[PDB]
Protein backbone atom coordinates (compact mmCIF):
# COMPACT_ATOMS: atom_id res chain seq x y z
CA UNK A 1 0.00 0.00 0.00
CA UNK A 2 3.06 2.26 0.32
CA UNK A 3 5.29 2.76 -2.72
CA UNK A 4 8.72 4.20 -1.94
CA UNK A 5 9.33 6.13 -5.18
CA UNK A 6 12.27 8.18 -3.86
CA UNK A 7 14.94 6.26 -5.81
CA UNK A 8 12.66 5.68 -8.79
CA UNK A 9 12.92 7.98 -11.79
CA UNK A 10 9.86 7.92 -14.03
CA UNK A 11 9.55 9.96 -17.22
CA UNK A 12 6.73 12.44 -17.72
CA UNK A 13 4.77 9.88 -19.72
CA UNK A 14 5.52 7.07 -17.27
CA UNK A 15 4.27 9.27 -14.45
CA UNK A 16 1.14 10.03 -16.47
CA UNK A 17 0.46 6.31 -16.87
CA UNK A 18 1.19 5.45 -13.23
CA UNK A 19 -1.09 8.23 -11.98
CA UNK A 20 -3.95 7.13 -14.21
CA UNK A 21 -3.57 3.58 -12.89
CA UNK A 22 -3.66 4.74 -9.27
CA UNK A 23 -6.71 6.89 -10.01
CA UNK A 24 -8.52 3.94 -11.59
CA UNK A 25 -7.30 1.52 -8.90
CA UNK A 26 -10.45 0.03 -7.31
CA UNK A 27 -8.71 -0.54 -3.97
CA UNK A 28 -7.69 3.12 -3.91
CA UNK A 29 -4.12 2.71 -5.07
CA UNK A 30 -0.75 2.80 -3.34
CA UNK A 31 0.69 5.73 -1.40
CA UNK A 32 3.35 7.67 -3.30
CA UNK A 33 6.14 8.12 -0.75
CA UNK A 34 8.93 10.45 -1.91
CA UNK A 35 10.94 11.31 1.21
CA UNK A 36 14.71 11.63 1.63
CA UNK A 37 15.33 9.50 4.72
CA UNK A 38 19.07 10.24 4.62
CA UNK A 39 18.60 13.99 5.11
CA UNK A 40 19.12 14.73 8.84
CA UNK A 41 17.65 18.25 8.71
CA UNK A 42 14.36 19.12 10.39
CA UNK A 43 11.45 20.26 8.21
CA UNK A 44 11.09 24.05 8.08
CA UNK A 45 7.52 23.53 6.94
CA UNK A 46 5.04 20.80 6.13
CA UNK A 47 2.49 21.79 3.50
CA UNK A 48 -1.01 20.39 3.93
CA UNK A 49 -2.07 20.20 0.29
CA UNK A 50 0.10 20.24 -2.81
CA UNK A 51 -1.97 22.33 -5.20
CA UNK A 52 -1.02 25.69 -6.71
CA UNK A 53 -0.27 27.30 -3.34
CA UNK A 54 1.40 24.26 -1.75
CA UNK A 55 3.48 23.24 -4.76
CA UNK A 56 4.78 26.76 -5.46
CA UNK A 57 5.38 27.51 -1.79
CA UNK A 58 7.42 24.32 -1.53
CA UNK A 59 9.30 25.11 -4.73
CA UNK A 60 10.26 28.53 -3.44
CA UNK A 61 11.13 27.30 0.06
CA UNK A 62 13.33 24.53 -1.32
CA UNK A 63 14.90 27.04 -3.72
CA UNK A 64 15.85 29.21 -0.73
CA UNK A 65 17.65 26.21 0.76
CA UNK A 66 15.07 25.09 3.32
CA UNK A 67 13.45 21.69 3.84
CA UNK A 68 9.81 20.96 3.05
CA UNK A 69 7.31 18.14 2.82
CA UNK A 70 4.04 18.09 0.91
CA UNK A 71 1.15 15.79 1.79
CA UNK A 72 -1.77 15.52 -0.64
CA UNK A 73 -4.71 13.12 -0.81
CA UNK A 74 -4.45 13.05 -4.61
CA UNK A 75 -1.83 10.92 -6.48
CA UNK A 76 -0.63 14.03 -8.34
CA UNK A 77 0.53 17.57 -7.57
CA UNK A 78 -1.03 20.71 -9.00
CA UNK A 79 -4.37 20.56 -7.24
CA UNK A 80 -7.75 21.33 -8.77
CA UNK A 81 -6.30 23.31 -11.68
CA UNK A 82 -5.26 20.34 -13.86
CA UNK A 83 -7.88 17.93 -12.50
CA UNK A 84 -11.17 19.87 -12.58
CA UNK A 85 -10.60 23.63 -12.64
CA UNK A 86 -8.54 26.00 -14.83
CA UNK A 87 -7.35 23.42 -17.34
CA UNK A 88 -10.66 21.79 -18.28
CA UNK A 89 -12.25 25.25 -18.27
CA UNK A 90 -9.80 26.48 -20.92
CA UNK A 91 -10.36 23.38 -23.05
CA UNK A 92 -14.09 24.14 -23.00
CA UNK A 93 -13.57 27.84 -23.76
CA UNK A 94 -11.42 26.96 -26.77
CA UNK A 95 -14.32 24.86 -28.06
CA UNK A 96 -16.76 27.69 -27.38
CA UNK A 97 -14.72 30.15 -29.45
CA UNK A 98 -14.19 27.70 -32.30
CA UNK A 99 -17.85 26.73 -32.37
CA UNK A 100 -19.04 30.33 -32.54
CA UNK A 101 -16.77 30.81 -35.56
CA UNK A 102 -18.06 27.62 -37.21
CA UNK A 103 -21.69 28.54 -36.58
CA UNK A 104 -21.22 32.10 -37.86
CA UNK A 105 -19.75 30.90 -41.16
CA UNK A 106 -21.72 27.65 -41.29
CA UNK A 107 -21.32 26.01 -44.69
CA UNK A 108 -19.14 28.76 -46.14
CA UNK A 109 -15.60 27.97 -47.27
CA UNK A 110 -14.27 24.97 -45.35
CA UNK A 111 -16.83 25.26 -42.55
CA UNK A 112 -19.43 22.46 -42.38
CA UNK A 113 -23.16 23.08 -41.96
CA UNK A 114 -23.89 23.70 -38.27
CA UNK A 115 -27.64 24.20 -38.65
CA UNK A 116 -29.38 21.63 -36.45
CA UNK A 117 -25.91 20.44 -35.39
CA UNK A 118 -25.50 19.52 -31.72
CA UNK A 119 -22.01 18.88 -30.38
CA UNK A 120 -21.58 16.11 -27.83
CA UNK A 121 -20.77 17.49 -24.38
CA UNK A 122 -19.79 14.09 -22.98
CA UNK A 123 -17.44 13.66 -25.96
CA UNK A 124 -15.48 16.75 -24.93
CA UNK A 125 -15.47 15.89 -21.23
CA UNK A 126 -14.26 12.40 -22.16
CA UNK A 127 -11.49 14.05 -24.18
CA UNK A 128 -10.48 15.94 -21.04
CA UNK A 129 -10.58 12.86 -18.80
CA UNK A 130 -8.52 10.95 -21.36
CA UNK A 131 -5.75 13.53 -21.41
CA UNK A 132 -5.68 15.21 -17.99
CA UNK A 133 -2.99 12.78 -16.84
CA UNK A 134 -0.52 14.46 -19.18
CA UNK A 135 -0.30 17.63 -17.07
CA UNK A 136 -0.41 15.48 -13.91
CA UNK A 137 2.66 13.59 -15.09
CA UNK A 138 4.63 16.75 -15.77
CA UNK A 139 3.75 18.06 -12.31
CA UNK A 140 5.00 14.96 -10.46
CA UNK A 141 8.06 14.84 -12.70
CA UNK A 142 8.96 18.54 -12.55
CA UNK A 143 8.36 18.60 -8.79
CA UNK A 144 10.57 15.59 -8.07
CA UNK A 145 13.28 15.77 -10.73
CA UNK A 146 13.54 19.54 -11.32
CA UNK A 147 12.37 21.24 -8.11
CA UNK A 148 13.83 18.66 -5.70
CA UNK A 149 10.66 18.50 -3.63
CA UNK A 150 9.74 15.89 -1.03
CA UNK A 151 6.16 14.67 -1.02
CA UNK A 152 3.68 11.99 -0.04
CA UNK A 153 0.75 11.69 -2.45
CA UNK A 154 -2.52 9.74 -2.50
CA UNK A 155 -2.65 10.08 1.28
CA UNK A 156 -4.93 12.32 3.39
CA UNK A 157 -2.97 14.24 6.01
CA UNK A 158 -3.67 13.84 9.72
CA UNK A 159 -2.64 17.00 11.55
CA UNK A 160 -1.81 16.15 15.18
CA UNK A 161 -0.85 19.62 16.42
CA UNK A 162 0.90 22.77 15.19
CA UNK A 163 4.20 20.90 14.81
CA UNK A 164 3.05 17.36 14.11
CA UNK A 165 1.54 15.59 11.11
CA UNK A 166 0.92 11.94 10.29
CA UNK A 167 1.31 10.64 6.74
CA UNK A 168 1.80 7.18 5.25
CA UNK A 169 1.42 5.80 8.76
CA UNK A 170 4.36 7.83 10.06
CA UNK A 171 4.78 10.91 12.26
CA UNK A 172 6.57 14.02 11.01
CA UNK A 173 7.65 17.09 12.97
CA UNK A 174 8.14 20.57 11.51
CA UNK A 175 8.95 24.09 12.67
CA UNK A 176 5.88 25.36 10.82
CA UNK A 177 2.69 24.24 9.10
CA UNK A 178 1.39 25.78 5.89
CA UNK A 179 -2.29 25.03 5.30
CA UNK A 180 -3.10 24.80 1.59
CA UNK A 181 -6.17 22.57 1.24
CA UNK A 182 -8.03 25.09 -0.92
CA UNK A 183 -11.80 25.31 -1.27
CA UNK A 184 -14.69 23.05 -2.26
CA UNK A 185 -17.77 23.48 -4.51
CA UNK A 186 -20.56 25.64 -3.12
CA UNK A 187 -23.76 23.87 -2.12
CA UNK A 188 -27.34 24.76 -3.04
CA UNK A 189 -29.98 24.22 -0.35
CA UNK A 190 -33.01 23.24 -2.43
CA UNK A 191 -34.90 19.96 -2.90
CA UNK A 192 -33.71 17.78 -5.76
CA UNK A 193 -30.16 19.15 -5.66
CA UNK A 194 -28.85 15.57 -5.43
CA UNK A 195 -30.84 14.33 -8.40
CA UNK A 196 -28.88 12.69 -11.21
CA UNK A 197 -28.08 15.33 -13.80
CA UNK A 198 -27.03 18.06 -11.36
CA UNK A 199 -23.33 18.88 -11.69
CA UNK A 200 -20.65 21.35 -10.63
CA UNK A 201 -17.13 21.71 -12.07
CA UNK A 202 -15.84 18.82 -9.93
CA UNK A 203 -18.51 16.18 -10.58
CA UNK A 204 -18.89 17.10 -14.27
CA UNK A 205 -15.51 15.59 -15.10
CA UNK A 206 -16.11 12.54 -12.91
CA UNK A 207 -19.77 11.52 -13.21
CA UNK A 208 -21.10 12.46 -16.67
CA UNK A 209 -22.29 9.08 -17.95
CA UNK A 210 -24.88 10.38 -20.41
CA UNK A 211 -25.27 13.00 -23.13
CA UNK A 212 -27.36 16.03 -22.00
CA UNK A 213 -30.64 16.99 -23.65
CA UNK A 214 -31.44 20.09 -25.71
CA UNK A 215 -31.75 22.49 -22.77
CA UNK A 216 -29.21 23.41 -20.12
CA UNK A 217 -29.76 25.37 -16.92
CA UNK A 218 -26.77 27.10 -15.34
CA UNK A 219 -27.09 28.48 -11.83
CA UNK A 220 -24.85 31.41 -10.95
CA UNK A 221 -23.38 34.52 -12.54
CA UNK A 222 -19.74 33.80 -11.73
CA UNK A 223 -16.90 33.37 -14.20
CA UNK A 224 -17.32 29.60 -14.08
CA UNK A 225 -21.05 29.80 -14.73
CA UNK A 226 -20.50 32.12 -17.69
CA UNK A 227 -17.52 30.21 -19.08
CA UNK A 228 -19.25 26.82 -18.87
CA UNK A 229 -22.54 28.35 -20.01
CA UNK A 230 -21.09 29.75 -23.23
CA UNK A 231 -19.58 26.32 -23.95
CA UNK A 232 -22.90 24.53 -23.42
CA UNK A 233 -24.61 27.11 -25.68
CA UNK A 234 -21.89 26.67 -28.31
CA UNK A 235 -22.65 22.95 -28.48
CA UNK A 236 -26.07 23.93 -29.78
CA UNK A 237 -28.17 23.71 -26.63
CA UNK A 238 -30.67 26.26 -25.30
CA UNK A 239 -28.80 27.73 -22.35
CA UNK A 240 -30.55 29.52 -19.51
CA UNK A 241 -28.52 31.21 -16.78
CA UNK A 242 -30.19 32.00 -13.45
CA UNK A 243 -28.31 34.84 -11.74
CA UNK A 244 -29.17 35.94 -8.20
CA UNK A 245 -28.13 39.56 -8.77
CA UNK A 246 -26.78 40.98 -12.05
CA UNK A 247 -24.36 39.19 -14.42
CA UNK A 248 -20.67 40.00 -14.87
CA UNK A 249 -20.50 42.81 -12.30
CA UNK A 250 -16.75 42.12 -12.45
CA UNK A 251 -16.60 44.08 -15.73
CA UNK A 252 -16.65 47.66 -14.40
CA UNK A 253 -16.69 49.47 -17.74
CA UNK A 254 -20.33 49.80 -18.77
CA UNK A 255 -19.75 49.79 -22.56
CA UNK A 256 -17.42 46.81 -22.30
CA UNK A 257 -19.92 44.86 -20.20
CA UNK A 258 -22.80 45.71 -22.56
CA UNK A 259 -20.80 44.53 -25.57
CA UNK A 260 -20.01 41.23 -23.82
CA UNK A 261 -23.60 40.65 -22.73
CA UNK A 262 -25.00 41.71 -26.12
CA UNK A 263 -22.81 39.18 -27.93
CA UNK A 264 -23.86 36.43 -25.51
CA UNK A 265 -27.55 37.13 -26.09
CA UNK A 266 -26.87 37.26 -29.85
CA UNK A 267 -25.56 33.69 -29.58
CA UNK A 268 -28.92 32.74 -28.10
CA UNK A 269 -28.11 32.72 -24.40
CA UNK A 270 -30.87 33.67 -21.99
CA UNK A 271 -29.76 35.55 -18.88
CA UNK A 272 -32.24 35.97 -16.05
CA UNK A 273 -31.03 38.24 -13.25
CA UNK A 274 -32.58 38.52 -9.81
CA UNK A 275 -33.44 34.82 -9.91
CA UNK A 276 -33.29 32.22 -7.14
CA UNK A 277 -33.73 28.48 -7.66
CA UNK A 278 -36.52 27.12 -5.48
CA UNK A 279 -36.64 23.51 -6.63
CA UNK A 280 -34.98 21.02 -8.94
CA UNK A 281 -37.59 18.52 -10.18
CA UNK A 282 -36.80 14.80 -10.16
CA UNK A 283 -38.47 12.28 -12.43
CA UNK A 284 -39.54 8.79 -11.38
CA UNK A 285 -35.97 7.70 -12.07
CA UNK A 286 -34.35 10.21 -9.72
CA UNK A 287 -33.21 12.16 -12.77
CA UNK A 288 -33.56 15.93 -13.20
CA UNK A 289 -36.57 16.91 -15.31
CA UNK A 290 -36.97 20.64 -14.66
CA UNK A 291 -35.87 23.63 -12.62
CA UNK A 292 -38.16 26.07 -10.84
CA UNK A 293 -36.92 29.49 -9.77
CA UNK A 294 -38.32 32.78 -8.53
CA UNK A 295 -37.57 35.76 -10.78
CA UNK A 296 -38.43 39.48 -10.67
CA UNK A 297 -41.26 38.69 -13.09
CA UNK A 298 -42.43 35.77 -10.99
CA UNK A 299 -41.96 32.01 -10.87
CA UNK A 300 -40.84 30.09 -13.95
CA UNK A 301 -40.23 26.45 -14.89
CA UNK A 302 -37.59 25.24 -17.34
CA UNK A 303 -37.58 21.65 -18.55
CA UNK A 304 -34.11 20.14 -18.58
CA UNK A 305 -32.17 17.01 -17.71
CA UNK A 306 -28.89 18.83 -17.14
CA UNK A 307 -28.12 21.45 -14.51
CA UNK A 308 -24.73 23.03 -13.87
CA UNK A 309 -24.03 24.83 -10.59
CA UNK A 310 -21.54 27.67 -10.82
CA UNK A 311 -21.63 28.89 -7.23
CA UNK A 312 -18.60 30.20 -5.37
CA UNK A 313 -16.27 27.71 -3.71
CA UNK A 314 -15.94 27.47 0.06
CA UNK A 315 -12.63 27.13 2.02
CA UNK A 316 -11.98 23.66 3.48
CA UNK A 317 -11.42 24.97 7.02
CA UNK A 318 -13.81 22.97 9.25
CA UNK A 319 -11.52 20.11 10.34
CA UNK A 320 -8.32 22.14 10.57
CA UNK A 321 -10.02 24.93 12.51
CA UNK A 322 -11.16 22.38 15.09
CA UNK A 323 -7.88 20.48 15.43
CA UNK A 324 -5.71 23.60 15.59
CA UNK A 325 -8.19 26.15 16.91
CA UNK A 326 -8.00 28.57 13.98
CA UNK A 327 -9.97 31.81 13.85
CA UNK A 328 -12.28 31.76 10.81
CA UNK A 329 -13.90 34.46 8.73
CA UNK A 330 -17.56 35.18 7.78
CA UNK A 331 -17.39 32.76 4.86
CA UNK A 332 -15.34 30.06 6.55
CA UNK A 333 -12.04 31.45 5.30
CA UNK A 334 -9.03 31.05 7.60
CA UNK A 335 -8.06 34.49 8.86
CA UNK A 336 -4.43 35.53 8.37
CA UNK A 337 -2.36 38.68 8.79
CA UNK A 338 -0.33 40.38 6.06
CA UNK A 339 2.34 37.69 6.46
CA UNK A 340 -0.12 34.84 5.85
CA UNK A 341 0.05 33.83 9.53
CA UNK A 342 -3.07 32.35 11.16
CA UNK A 343 -4.17 32.89 14.76
CA UNK A 344 -2.16 29.81 15.73
CA UNK A 345 1.64 30.13 16.16
CA UNK A 346 3.80 28.63 13.41
CA UNK A 347 0.71 27.99 11.27
CA UNK A 348 0.22 29.74 7.92
CA UNK A 349 -2.71 29.62 5.48
CA UNK A 350 -2.61 30.25 1.72
CA UNK A 351 -4.58 29.88 -1.52
CA UNK A 352 -8.35 29.52 -1.77
CA UNK A 353 -8.30 28.59 1.92
CA UNK A 354 -7.89 32.25 2.87
CA UNK A 355 -10.60 33.54 0.56
CA UNK A 356 -10.75 35.73 -2.50
CA UNK A 357 -9.48 36.59 -4.90
CA UNK A 358 -9.54 32.89 -5.77
CA UNK A 359 -7.11 33.02 -8.69
CA UNK A 360 -3.93 31.11 -9.53
CA UNK A 361 -1.64 34.14 -9.14
CA UNK A 362 -2.98 34.67 -5.61
CA UNK A 363 -2.58 31.01 -4.65
CA UNK A 364 0.96 30.69 -6.01
CA UNK A 365 2.18 34.03 -4.70
CA UNK A 366 0.69 33.65 -1.22
CA UNK A 367 2.32 30.23 -1.12
CA UNK A 368 5.73 31.68 -1.93
CA UNK A 369 5.38 34.58 0.50
CA UNK A 370 4.43 32.25 3.35
CA UNK A 371 7.55 30.23 2.54
CA UNK A 372 9.75 33.32 2.62
CA UNK A 373 8.37 34.31 6.02
CA UNK A 374 8.94 30.76 7.27
CA UNK A 375 12.56 31.09 6.15
CA UNK A 376 12.99 34.26 8.21
CA UNK A 377 12.31 36.75 5.42
CA UNK A 378 9.51 38.97 6.76
CA UNK A 379 7.44 39.97 3.74
CA UNK A 380 3.80 41.05 3.48
CA UNK A 381 1.31 40.18 0.78
CA UNK A 382 -2.00 41.85 -0.01
CA UNK A 383 -3.36 41.34 -3.54
CA UNK A 384 -4.63 44.51 -5.20
CA UNK A 385 -4.58 46.34 -8.54
CA UNK A 386 -4.21 43.15 -10.53
CA UNK A 387 -5.46 42.42 -14.05
CA UNK A 388 -8.34 39.98 -14.51
CA UNK A 389 -10.17 38.11 -17.23
CA UNK A 390 -12.93 35.66 -18.06
CA UNK A 391 -14.24 33.73 -21.07
CA UNK A 392 -17.62 33.91 -22.82
CA UNK A 393 -17.30 32.96 -26.51
CA UNK A 394 -14.64 35.70 -26.43
CA UNK A 395 -11.67 36.41 -24.21
CA UNK A 396 -12.49 39.34 -21.90
CA UNK A 397 -9.66 41.28 -20.27
CA UNK A 398 -9.78 44.21 -17.86
CA UNK A 399 -7.67 46.20 -15.43
CA UNK A 400 -7.97 49.47 -13.56
CA UNK A 401 -10.98 51.75 -13.85
CA UNK A 402 -14.01 51.71 -16.10
CA UNK A 403 -14.97 54.95 -17.88
CA UNK A 404 -17.93 55.89 -15.65
CA UNK A 405 -16.05 54.79 -12.52
CA UNK A 406 -13.14 57.13 -13.28
CA UNK A 407 -15.38 60.16 -13.85
CA UNK A 408 -17.37 59.42 -10.71
CA UNK A 409 -14.05 59.33 -8.81
CA UNK A 410 -13.32 62.88 -9.91
CA UNK A 411 -10.99 62.25 -12.86
CA UNK A 412 -11.25 64.45 -15.94
CA UNK A 413 -10.84 61.86 -18.71
CA UNK A 414 -10.68 61.16 -22.42
CA UNK A 415 -10.97 57.71 -23.93
CA UNK A 416 -9.50 55.97 -26.96
CA UNK A 417 -11.53 53.03 -28.21
CA UNK A 418 -12.49 50.98 -31.22
CA UNK A 419 -14.84 51.00 -32.89
CA UNK A 420 -15.54 54.75 -32.73
CA UNK A 421 -18.87 56.30 -31.71
CA UNK A 422 -20.61 56.99 -35.03
CA UNK A 423 -24.06 56.32 -36.47
CA UNK A 424 -22.69 53.09 -37.96
CA UNK A 425 -21.89 51.95 -34.42
CA UNK A 426 -20.33 48.50 -34.09
CA UNK A 427 -21.03 47.72 -37.74
CA UNK A 428 -17.53 48.62 -38.97
CA UNK A 429 -14.44 46.54 -39.86
CA UNK A 430 -12.54 47.45 -36.67
CA UNK A 431 -11.12 46.54 -34.27
CA UNK A 432 -9.39 43.62 -36.00
CA UNK A 433 -6.47 41.21 -35.68
CA UNK A 434 -5.64 37.52 -35.24
CA UNK A 435 -8.84 35.46 -34.85
CA UNK A 436 -11.21 38.36 -35.58
CA UNK A 437 -10.33 38.87 -39.26
CA UNK A 438 -13.17 36.68 -40.58
CA UNK A 439 -15.68 38.61 -38.46
CA UNK A 440 -14.19 41.90 -39.66
CA UNK A 441 -14.56 40.93 -43.33
CA UNK A 442 -17.69 38.77 -43.27
CA UNK A 443 -21.09 39.96 -44.49
CA UNK A 444 -23.10 41.21 -41.53
CA UNK A 445 -20.46 40.08 -39.01
CA UNK A 446 -18.34 43.24 -38.58
CA UNK A 447 -19.95 44.05 -35.23
CA UNK A 448 -18.47 40.78 -33.95
CA UNK A 449 -14.88 41.90 -34.56
CA UNK A 450 -14.41 43.08 -30.99
CA UNK A 451 -14.38 46.02 -28.61
CA UNK A 452 -11.60 47.76 -26.70
CA UNK A 453 -10.89 50.92 -24.72
CA UNK A 454 -8.33 52.69 -22.55
CA UNK A 455 -9.28 55.29 -19.96
CA UNK A 456 -6.90 58.23 -19.65
CA UNK A 457 -6.61 61.07 -17.14
CA UNK A 458 -6.80 64.24 -19.25
CA UNK A 459 -4.48 66.20 -16.96
CA UNK A 460 -1.81 63.71 -15.86
CA UNK A 461 -2.06 61.93 -19.21
CA UNK A 462 -1.83 58.61 -17.32
CA UNK A 463 -3.74 55.46 -18.32
CA UNK A 464 -6.30 54.62 -15.60
CA UNK A 465 -7.88 51.51 -17.10
CA UNK A 466 -7.78 49.13 -20.07
CA UNK A 467 -10.54 46.89 -21.41
CA UNK A 468 -10.62 44.40 -24.27
CA UNK A 469 -12.99 41.92 -25.89
CA UNK A 470 -11.64 39.63 -28.60
CA UNK A 471 -8.62 37.31 -28.64
CA UNK A 472 -4.89 37.49 -27.95
CA UNK A 473 -4.79 40.31 -25.36
CA UNK A 474 -4.98 38.35 -22.10
CA UNK A 475 -1.23 37.68 -22.00
CA UNK A 476 -0.52 41.33 -22.84
CA UNK A 477 -2.62 42.56 -19.90
CA UNK A 478 -0.18 40.85 -17.50
CA UNK A 479 2.65 43.10 -18.67
CA UNK A 480 0.58 46.16 -19.53
CA UNK A 481 -0.67 46.21 -15.92
CA UNK A 482 2.90 46.39 -14.63
CA UNK A 483 3.62 49.40 -16.87
CA UNK A 484 0.41 51.08 -15.75
CA UNK A 485 1.26 50.57 -12.07
CA UNK A 486 4.59 52.25 -12.81
CA UNK A 487 2.80 55.29 -14.21
CA UNK A 488 2.22 54.90 -17.96
CA UNK A 489 1.14 57.92 -20.02
CA UNK A 490 -0.49 58.12 -23.44
CA UNK A 491 2.78 59.59 -24.74
CA UNK A 492 4.90 56.68 -23.48
CA UNK A 493 2.32 54.19 -24.77
CA UNK A 494 2.43 55.99 -28.11
CA UNK A 495 6.21 55.78 -28.22
CA UNK A 496 6.28 51.97 -28.05
CA UNK A 497 6.80 49.64 -31.03
CA UNK A 498 3.54 48.00 -32.02
CA UNK A 499 3.28 44.64 -33.80
CA UNK A 500 0.51 45.32 -36.33
CA UNK A 501 -2.07 43.99 -36.58
CA UNK A 502 -2.30 43.91 -32.80
CA UNK A 503 -5.11 42.53 -30.58
CA UNK A 504 -4.82 45.78 -28.60
CA UNK A 505 -4.43 48.94 -30.70
CA UNK A 506 -3.60 51.10 -27.68
CA UNK A 507 -0.13 52.01 -28.94
CA UNK A 508 -0.81 53.51 -32.37
CA UNK A 509 -4.16 55.02 -31.37
CA UNK A 510 -2.46 56.74 -28.43
CA UNK A 511 0.15 58.07 -30.85
CA UNK A 512 -2.62 59.63 -32.94
CA UNK A 513 -3.67 61.85 -30.02
CA UNK A 514 -0.41 62.27 -28.05
CA UNK A 515 0.73 65.18 -30.20
CA UNK A 516 -1.80 67.56 -28.65
CA UNK A 517 -1.11 69.24 -25.32
CA UNK A 518 -4.88 69.17 -24.86
CA UNK A 519 -6.08 65.57 -25.16
CA UNK A 520 -9.15 64.66 -27.18
CA UNK A 521 -10.92 61.30 -27.24
CA UNK A 522 -10.85 59.05 -30.29
Ligand X SMILES: Cc1cc2nc3c(=O)[nH]c(=O)nc-3n(C[C@H](O)[C@H](O)[C@H](O)COP(=O)(O)OP(=O)(O)OC[C@H]3O[C@@H](n4cnc5c(N)ncnc54)[C@H](O)[C@@H]3O)c2cc1C
Ligand Y SMILES: O=S(=O)(O)CCS
Q: What residue ranges bind ligand X (CB under 6 A)?
A: 48-54, 71-74, 79-81, 85-86, 89, 156-157, 180-182, 201, 224, 313, 316, 351-353, 358-360, 363, 500
155 is catalytic: no
Q: Could you say whether residue 261 binds ligand Y (CB under 6 A)? A: no
- What DSSP string describes 325-337? T--B-TTSPBP--
395 to 434, contacts with a second copy by CB under 8 A?
395, 397, 419-420, 422-424, 427-430, 432-434
429 marked as part of a ligand binding site: no
What interhelical angle do 121-131 and 86-104 show, nearest 10?
140
81 is catalytic: yes
Q: How far apart are CA 19 and CA 9, in angstroms?
A: 14
308 is catalytic: no
Backbone angles phi, psi at 261, to 5 degrees: -65, -40
244 marked as part of a ligand binding site: yes
Cβ closest to ligand Y, residue 215 vs residue 436: 436
Q: Tell me which of 23, 61, 77, 340 is the catalytic residue.
A: 77
Q: Which does residue 318 bind out of ligand X, a second copy, ligand Y, none, counting CB within 5 to 8 angstroms by kind?
A: none
Q: Any idea how long the chain is?
A: 522
* Shortest Cβ 284–ligand X spacing (Å): 32
* Neighbouring C-beta atoms of residue 233, cutoff 10 Å: 25
Q: Tell me which of 23, 61, 81, 493 is the catalytic residue.
A: 81
Closest CA to 225 of 214, 236, 233: 233
168: left (phi over 0), alpha (psi -120 to 50) or beta: left
Q: Could you say whether residue 318 binds a second copy (CB under 8 A)? A: no
Closest CA to 66 of 148, 165, 152, 180: 148
Q: How far apart are CA 440 and CA 510, in angstroms?
A: 22
* Neighbouring C-beta atoms of residue 495, cutoff 10 Å: 12
Q: Which does residue 358 bind out of ligand Y, ligand X, a second copy, none, counting CB within 5 to 8 angstroms by kind?
A: ligand X
Cβ closest to ligand Y, residue 426 vs residue 430: 430
Site string for ligand Y, 415-454 (x = CB under 6 A): ---x-----------xx-----------------------
Site string for a second copy, 108-137 (x = CB under 8 A): -xxxx-x--x-xx--xx--xx-xxx-xx-x
479 to 498, contacts with a second copy by CB under 8 A?
479-483, 495-498
Q: Tell me which of 23, 47, 92, 136 is the catalytic residue.
A: 136
Instruction: Give break positions in the chain: residue before each, C–N beyond 2.5 Å.
Output: none
Closest CA to 74 of 45, 36, 31: 31
Among 55, 362, 468, 513, binds ligand Y (CB under 6 A): 55
52 marked as part of a ligand binding site: yes
Q: How far apart are CA 202 and CA 83, in angstroms?
A: 8
Q: What angle (nearest 5°) sits at the alpha carbon of residue 96, between those of residues 80 and 222?
A: 50
478 to 517, contacts with ligand Y by CB under 6 A?
505, 508
Give the distance from CA 481 to its chain's centroid. Answer: 19
Among 22, 23, 81, 218, binds ligand Y (CB under 6 A): 81
136 is catalytic: yes
Q: How many residues bind ligand Y (CB under 6 A)?
A: 15
Q: How far apart are CA 174 and CA 159, in angstroms?
A: 11
Q: 330 with 317: CB under 8 angstroms?
A: no
391 is catalytic: no
Q: Which does residue 114 bind out of ligand X, ligand Y, a second copy, none, counting CB within 5 to 8 angstroms by kind?
A: a second copy
Which span (93-101, 207-215, 250-258, 290-298) binds a second copy, by CB under 8 A?
93-101
Residue 315 pairs with which residues in a beta bridge? 183
* Shortest Cβ 180–ligand X spacing (Å): 5
Residues designated as active site? 77, 81, 86, 136, 500
Amino acid sequence: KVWNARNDHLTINQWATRIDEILEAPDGGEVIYNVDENDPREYDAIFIGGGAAGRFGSAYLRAMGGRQLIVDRWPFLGGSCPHNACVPHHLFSDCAAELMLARTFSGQYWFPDMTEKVVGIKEVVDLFRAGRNGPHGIMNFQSKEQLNLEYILNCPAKVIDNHTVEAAGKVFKAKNLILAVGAGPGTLDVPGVNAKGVFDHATLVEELDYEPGSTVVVVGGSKTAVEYGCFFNATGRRTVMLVRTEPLKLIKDNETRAYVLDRMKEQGMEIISGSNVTRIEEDANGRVQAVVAMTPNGEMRIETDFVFLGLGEQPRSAELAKILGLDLGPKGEVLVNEYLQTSVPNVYAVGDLIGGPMEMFKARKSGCYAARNVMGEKISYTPKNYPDFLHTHYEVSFLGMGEEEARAAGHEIVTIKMPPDTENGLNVALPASDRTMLYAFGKGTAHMSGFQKIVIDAKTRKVLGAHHVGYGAKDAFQYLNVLIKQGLTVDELGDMDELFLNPTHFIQLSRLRAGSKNLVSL
